[PDB]
Amino acid sequence: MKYMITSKGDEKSDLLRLNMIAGFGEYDMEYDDVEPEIVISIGGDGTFLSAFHQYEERLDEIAFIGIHTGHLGFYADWRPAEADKLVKLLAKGEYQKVSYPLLKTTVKYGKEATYLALNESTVKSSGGPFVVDVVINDIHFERFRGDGLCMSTPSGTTAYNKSLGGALMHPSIEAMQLTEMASINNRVYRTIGSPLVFPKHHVVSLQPVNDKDFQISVDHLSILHRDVQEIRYEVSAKKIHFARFRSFPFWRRVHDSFIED
Amino acid sequence: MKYMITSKGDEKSDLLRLNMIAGFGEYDMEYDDVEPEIVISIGGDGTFLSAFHQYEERLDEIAFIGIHTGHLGFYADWRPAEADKLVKLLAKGEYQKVSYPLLKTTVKYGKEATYLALNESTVKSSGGPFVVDVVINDIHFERFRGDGLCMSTPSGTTAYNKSLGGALMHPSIEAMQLTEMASINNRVYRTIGSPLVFPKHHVVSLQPVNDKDFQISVDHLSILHRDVQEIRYEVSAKKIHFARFRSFPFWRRVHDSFIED
Amino acid sequence: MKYMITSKGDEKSDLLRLNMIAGFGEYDMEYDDVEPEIVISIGGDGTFLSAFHQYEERLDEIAFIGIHTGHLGFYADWRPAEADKLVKLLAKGEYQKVSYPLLKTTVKYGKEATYLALNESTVKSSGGPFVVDVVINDIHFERFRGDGLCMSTPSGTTAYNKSLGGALMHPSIEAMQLTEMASINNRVYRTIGSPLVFPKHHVVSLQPVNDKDFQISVDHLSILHRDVQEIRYEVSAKKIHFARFRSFPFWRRVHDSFIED
Amino acid sequence: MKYMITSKGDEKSDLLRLNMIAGFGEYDMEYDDVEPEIVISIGGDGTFLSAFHQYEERLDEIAFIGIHTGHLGFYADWRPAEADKLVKLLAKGEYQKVSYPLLKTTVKYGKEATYLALNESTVKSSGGPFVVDVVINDIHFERFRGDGLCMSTPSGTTAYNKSLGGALMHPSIEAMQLTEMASINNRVYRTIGSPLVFPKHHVVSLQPVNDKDFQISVDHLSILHRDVQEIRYEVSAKKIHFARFRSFPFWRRVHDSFIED
Ligand SMILES: CN(CC#Cc1nc2c(N)ncnc2n1[C@@H]1O[C@H](CO)[C@@H](O)[C@H]1OP(=O)(O)O)C[C@H]1O[C@@H](n2cnc3c(N)ncnc32)[C@H](O)[C@@H]1O
Ligand SMILES: CN(CC#Cc1nc2c(N)ncnc2n1[C@@H]1O[C@H](CO)[C@@H](O)[C@H]1OP(=O)(O)O)C[C@H]1O[C@@H](n2cnc3c(N)ncnc32)[C@H](O)[C@@H]1O
Ligand SMILES: CN(CC#Cc1nc2c(N)ncnc2n1[C@@H]1O[C@H](CO)[C@@H](O)[C@H]1OP(=O)(O)O)C[C@H]1O[C@@H](n2cnc3c(N)ncnc32)[C@H](O)[C@@H]1O
Ligand SMILES: CN(CC#Cc1nc2c(N)ncnc2n1[C@@H]1O[C@H](CO)[C@@H](O)[C@H]1OP(=O)(O)O)C[C@H]1O[C@@H](n2cnc3c(N)ncnc32)[C@H](O)[C@@H]1O
């Protein structure tokens, strides 16, 4: 099939990439970085996040593989030594695919712009204080004042979501999780405090009250949006598909990353 | 159909119960507290929890209704004024049923005993320090030392789980959530810290290392178990069925209970 | 004595200010906004913070008073109705003074710039990731990666510090408190997690490792510093002096602000 | 001077104890376990806590030393290899003493009983729910419902207090810190949430409202008190005196214990 390989850029990743292409060369495998069916990421989770967004418009025609040259990642969870063993099983085929849920973000102006996130999407204070109205399925849930909010995919719960006190969710759960960044809670302002886990079809809407500029981030892409009036969060109908070749369970990936490998 | 009504016991609850039975008397409705199809709880969530466990062996043949005489509850979410309106719609039928997931607990000795929880099941220090090995789908995940652990149903996440830093989960999500009670984390002991959200079929096993006595609780039932060697947690295959007669969404119930009614 | 009055600017604050000046006019009191001995703030804590920094170079020659026209504040803790009673006791004299500790921030370049904070001073990510080395009395304590850090005065612990999980400290304690903003903790990065309470003479130093630009804030003043190599935190030798005229204890101020007035 | 040595009891601690007594034998040093001036603890912090309470009635006539045979402790912070070097400097004298603050607990019945804590004193649910009124300097601050409360000395903030979210306090600060154990916070019940740091002379009083039985703990001593009506917490006037022979600063002890030795 068509394949391509992206690299962190350092000497170790570029050289493992050149060795896999060489191993791939002796097969019915064509390197193609326009319409690949297999996207291999060599580096870290950030390298994988770049690879995902590089091909977010062909998600249903692509299986992703992550190779970590540094420490173990959650998307780059195969080490370099098995790359030669990886070439072989990628060549024949015959491998199950694993699908993780994604988060859809809709940003409306006064036109709109949608985005797709693998880790999380965050909304932040543009310069002055951050006050937004939180609306859940068209019901006003709370008026939030603080540093910002974070809406996380299941696989993203080990990322920014974990640092904000969120729960770690197994990626087979089609859900999204909202966490607060340093909220005020006094006699004037009241927020729920706890992280909120939303299922499919539930729409969380963030609406400004005073300022209308915000720092909106989607994974590592962070741009300041102007003249916004709504940020809609929703479990996407699209999924990211991983090529699977042996059992590396999620809770084991959590154990190795946070307890001790 | 067969029905029965349980009461908190105070003057207000006993009298609303006697008025609903009177309203029920003028219908094709027989009061029966052995094999009811409709179980009405008058009082609070605790009164409802008692009503659930009173009939946990006929869960698939029962629809539950909760009436709160005091503050708003999450299971007792209809106020007394609509009880007369409640009698009518219960009499004809024609009402959708709502199903919430339950948590199954298995306790093994050296025989075994299983239990069913609507809120949560907790395991606690029997007197000396609490040390248990946490095993997820037969993999050793961590060695926990602290005050105890709490495994919560979705509808239970607003109860004890919320006080322990857990996330609030919408009850349509078939899952269970584990939270820590005051764990030690130093160079010797290491725990994940974050709450963990597990899907169906995932089995969390708690295994003792030193002492084998524990305070195990299931909802308000808390008994000390002796000579245990395993506590297994798992999303139950059974569900609790609620009689539904109008839209009182979960996130609104959360708003009214924690933000301001 | 010399006095001056600052106002939030709205109609209510400007008019209470004009009435106190009128009441002050019938006394041996001269309005002077260059070298006052009494600085009255009318509005909120933010109005008081502006009044403090407006006169931070004459702290030992000034007693501060706060009047809240809106909700109760921690520095603006007298309501408008007692302003006429306030005029009288300010005129005669004979009132004890209360002193709260301040936080000193030193920012070095490659010259230096020092600052004085009543609430807190925070250091934040300038655009890229935030990584700093934390040094306590010239010992390397930890390498922090996250959103930022917050060093709070005692009276500031109810402000930003409280939202970040810090402890509330009685202002008679000459100390400063450091809290983390969303830190990463995995096999690579390790931070203490808990808030740290430092006494007098203890110097906490923040040193960059990669980027050298930071968003440094001091109370509501937030400016981006360039080419920094050290941010030093230390309990200041200066104190803010409040004019006291009746007992409004701190823990009562906490109760009224966060429990219910 | 008079001295004595206590041991964890295992083979390693008993044998290091017998070697120090031998080294002590060749000096103007008399082993005396009734009125020692030097109390050496060999084992861990728990062994040291037992040694402190064994002599809490002669605190002002005793200097304490801790030797850790296992991992590094906060009171047992010298390793066995320097015990022979420890014998010499203990023999001559000429060493500064370090003093840490203690926490005084008063428990009243309907007579009273006072206690002294080096780490913390906790109050817990006796069997039924835990509800107490929190009173600060004779003002009603809050009505707490939850698992319990913990009042910690400065040196105790790295113990149970740290697991409950409290701040780490340098032991030169004469203070005490209160933290909550899993409190309920809804429209009915309201607690401050944040840890509270109290100075000298401040009296925190816990008063029951419904049940009057409680599990009160002081360090590792935990006994159930009956017919109580008040638990008073206060920074003690007594201090524990440590024999100091080189610089092992507190924040370094924190670094080595929680970051990495
Ligand atoms: C440049 N990164 C790429 C990546 C990744 C990333 N994704 C995940 C994930 N899904 N589960 C766990 N670990 C993850 N990683 C690691 O996390 C660190 C920060 O990159 C790195 O070790 C990553 O690892 P690797 O790239 O060094 O191999 C942007 C991301 O950073 C997250 N993020 C931002 N701010 C904070 C913060 N304050 N605290 C914690 N996380 C934060 C956020 O989610 C964003 O998408
Ligand atoms: C006697 N109760 C019955 C009930 C209920 C209960 N269930 C829920 C729920 N699912 N979502 C939210 N609120 C809930 N409620 C309320 O919670 C308080 C404590 O009953 C009361 O107001 C309840 O309300 P109502 O009875 O006064 O109307 C035992 C339960 O207490 C929980 N629990 C135990 N210890 C703690 C603690 N330390 N912190 C918080 N919750 C705790 C635990 O889950 C247990 O099953
Ligand atoms: C514009 N403010 C002025 C003030 C004041 C301020 N100081 C204090 C204080 N010492 N103890 C308690 N309450 C305080 N207040 C209130 O706090 C809210 C935010 O102003 C307002 O109600 C204040 O009240 P009043 O102005 O509406 O009357 C900047 C400050 O905001 C703090 N701050 C910034 N970001 C956050 C955040 N994410 N969460 C919580 N606090 C934050 C920070 O400390 C900064 O100095
Ligand atoms: C039997 N212990 C003796 C000791 C000591 C103790 N004191 C301190 C301290 N001041 N600073 C930091 N570390 C400390 N240690 C360690 O802490 C662990 C638990 O002993 C052990 O490693 C201790 O170490 P060492 O004995 O193995 O060498 C009772 C104490 O346990 C604390 N405690 C109780 N319950 C919990 C909990 N749920 N979480 C955390 N701490 C708890 C409480 O404070 C009590 O006085």
Q: Is D68 helix (H, G, I), strand (E, B) or coil?
A: strand
Q: Which tokens belong to C247?
A: 């007992």
Distance CA B66, CA B72 (A): 10
CA count, 13 A, side-chain hemisphere, B248: 20
Distance CA A134, CA C258 (A): 22
Find out whether the beta carbon of D44 lies less than 6 Å from any atom of ligand 4: yes
Bridge partner residues of A239 (DSSP): A101
Q: Is B185 annotated as a binding residue?
A: no
Alpha helices (H) along chain D: 11-25, 45-54, 83-92, 160-163, 250-258
Q: Is D127 helix (H, G, I), strand (E, B) or coil?
A: coil
CATH assignment, B102-237: 2.60.200.30
Contacts of D15 (CB under 8 A, 6+ apart): none
Amino acid in position A21:
I
Contacts of D176 (CB under 8 A, 6+ apart): D101, D103, D151, D152, D153, D154, D197, D198, D202, D204, D233, D234, D235
Q: Is B236 annotated as a binding residue?
A: no
For chain C, the C-alpha Rg in angstroms (whole number) is 20
Report the neighbours of C using a cutoff of 3 or more CB pairs below 8 angstroms: A, D
Q: Which tokens belong to C182?
A: 């969303």
**For residues A199 and A104, is the Cβ–Cβ distance under 8 A?**
no
Distance CA C229, CA C248 (A): 42
Distance CA A55, CA A38 (A): 11
Query: Which residue has tokens 């809709």?
Result: A106
Handedness of CA D210, D211, D212, D215 (dihedral sign): negative
Backbone angles phi, psi at B248, to 5 degrees: -130, 80
For chain A, the C-alpha Rg in angstroms (whole number) is 20
Handedness of CA B123, B183, B162, B44 (dihedral sign): positive
Residue A184 Cα to ligand 3 midpoint, Å, equals: 8
**CB-nearest partner of A183 from C163, C183, C188:** C163
**CB-nearest partner of B258 from D71, D186, D258:** D186
**For residues D169 and D175, is the Cβ–Cβ distance under 8 A?**
yes
**For residues D181 and D149, is the Cβ–Cβ distance under 8 A?**
yes
How was this entry determined?
A: X-ray
**For residues C165 and C195, is the Cβ–Cβ distance under 8 A?**
yes
Query: Which residue has tokens 């809290």?
Result: C179
CA–CA–CA angle D209, D213, D215 (5° rounding): 115
Q: Residues, chain D, total?
A: 261
End-to-end CA distance of chain A: 35
**For residues D67 and D31, is the Cβ–Cβ distance under 8 A?**
no
Using DSSP bridges, classify how beta strands A38-43 and A2-7 pair: parallel, antiparallel or unpaired.
parallel
Distance CA B21, CA B31 (A): 8
Distance CA D73, CA A31 (A): 58
Q: Which tokens belong to D120?
A: 């913390």
Distance CA B178, CA B164 (A): 10
Distance CA D76, CA B94 (A): 71
**CB-nearest partner of D182 from B163, B183, B188:** B163
**For residues A54 and A81, is the Cβ–Cβ distance under 8 A?**
no
C-beta neighbour count of A189 within 10 angstroms:
14
Distance CA A222, CA B213 (A): 52
Q: Which residues of D touch B260 (CB under 8 A)?
A: 187
Residue B108 Cα to ligand 1 midpoint, Å, equals: 41
D146 touches chain B (CB under 8 A): yes
- Closest of A49, A177, D172, D34 to residue B170, by C-alpha: A177
- Closest of D32, D36, D96 to residue D246, by C-alpha: D96
C160 touches chain A (CB under 8 A): yes
For chain D, the domains span 1-101+238-261, 102-237
Q: Is B261 annotated as a binding residue?
A: no
D77: exposed, middle or buried (Cβ count in 10 Å: 0-12, 13-18, 19+):
buried
Q: Is D116 helix (H, G, I), strand (E, B) or coil?
A: strand
Torsion of CA D131, D136, D138, D140, to 10 degrees: -50
Query: Which residue has tokens 């199954």?
Result: B104
Distance CA B125, CA B216 (A): 9
C-beta neighbour count of D19 within 10 angstroms:
14
Torsion of CA C168, C173, C174, C177, to 10 degrees: -20
Backbone angles phi, psi at C119, to 5 degrees: -95, -75
For chain D, the C-alpha Rg in angstroms (whole number) is 20
CB contact under 8 A, B251 and A172: no
Residue of A nearest to B169 (CA): A197
Q: Is C11 helix (H, G, I), strand (E, B) or coil?
A: helix
Residue D160 Cα to ligand 4 midpoint, Å, equals: 6
Q: Which of residues 186-225 of B touch D (CB under 8 A)?
A: 186-188
Q: Which residues of A129-159 are buried (b: 16+ CB within 10 A; e: fewer)?
A: ebbbebbbeeeebbbbbbbbbbbbbbbbbbb
CA–CA–CA angle B38, B40, B43 (5° rounding): 170
D39 alpha-carbon distance from chain centroid? 16
Distance CA A132, CA A206 (A): 6
C-beta neighbour count of B60 within 10 angstroms:
10
Q: Is D120 annotated as a binding residue?
A: yes
Amino acid in position B117:
A
CB contact under 8 A, D137 and C254: no
Residue C44 Cα to ligand 3 midpoint, Å, equals: 10
Catalytic residue annotation of A: 45
Eight-class DSSP state of B167: P
Bridge partner residues of B149 (DSSP): B123, B180
Query: Which residue has tokens 């003028």?
Result: B26
Find out whether the beta carbon of D49 lies less than 6 Å from any atom of ligand 4: yes
Q: Which residues of B touch A190 (CB under 8 A)?
A: 259-260
Residue A189 Cα to ligand 3 midpoint, Å, equals: 12
Handedness of CA D144, D147, D151, D154 (dihedral sign): negative
Distance CA B182, CA B173 (A): 27
Query: Which residue has tokens 């709160």?
Result: B68
Distance CA A122, CA B230 (A): 41
**For residues C199 and C235, is the Cβ–Cβ distance under 8 A?**
yes
Contacts of D49 (CB under 8 A, 6+ apart): D75, D118, D119, D219, D220
CA–CA–CA angle C40, C44, C50 (5° rounding): 65
Residue nearest to atom 23 of ligand 2 (CA): B45
Largest separation between any pair of C-alpha atoms in chain A: 70
- Closest of A195, A185, A106 to residue A149, by C-alpha: A195
Distance CA C16, CA C12 (A): 6
Q: Which tokens belong to C150?
A: 């917050």
Query: Which residue has tokens 């030097």?
Result: D38
C-beta neighbour count of D127 within 10 angstroms:
12
**For residues B177 and B212, is the Cβ–Cβ distance under 8 A?**
no
Query: Which residue has tokens 């100075």?
Result: D199
Handedness of CA A207, A208, A212, A216 (dihedral sign): negative
Eight-class DSSP state of D80: G
Residue B17, H or E segment: helix B11-25
Residue D217, H or E segment: strand D214-218
Backbone angles phi, psi at D115, to 5 degrees: -145, 165
Distance CA D36, CA D243 (A): 13
Handedness of CA D34, D36, D39, D43 (dihedral sign): negative
Q: What is the stated resolution of the deposited model, in angstroms?
A: 2.3
Q: Which tokens belong to D127?
A: 């069997």
Quickly list DSSP for D157-211: GGTHHHHTTPPEE-TTS-EEEEEEEEE--SSS-----S-EEEETT--EEEEESS-
Quickly list DSSP for A138-193: TEEEEEEEEEEEEEE-SGGGGTHHHHTTPPEE-TTS-EEEEEEEEE--SSS-----
Quickly list DSSP for B194-208: S-EEEETT--EEEEE
Query: Which residue among D12, D45, D155, D219 is best mutated to probe the pocket of ligand 4, counting the most ligand atoms within 8 A of its Cβ?
Result: D45
Using DSSP bridges, classify how beta strands C38-43 and C63-68 pair: parallel, antiparallel or unpaired.
parallel
Q: Which tokens belong to C100?
A: 């709260």
- Verify whether residue D45 is a known catalytic residue: yes
Q: Is C51 helix (H, G, I), strand (E, B) or coil?
A: helix
C-beta neighbour count of C101 within 10 angstroms:
23
Interface test with A, best of B135, B176, B205, B259 (most A CBs within 10 A): B259
Q: Is B69 annotated as a binding residue?
A: no
Identified catalytic residue from B45, B77, B138, B213: B45
CB contact under 8 A, C173 and D177: no
End-to-end CA distance of chain B: 35
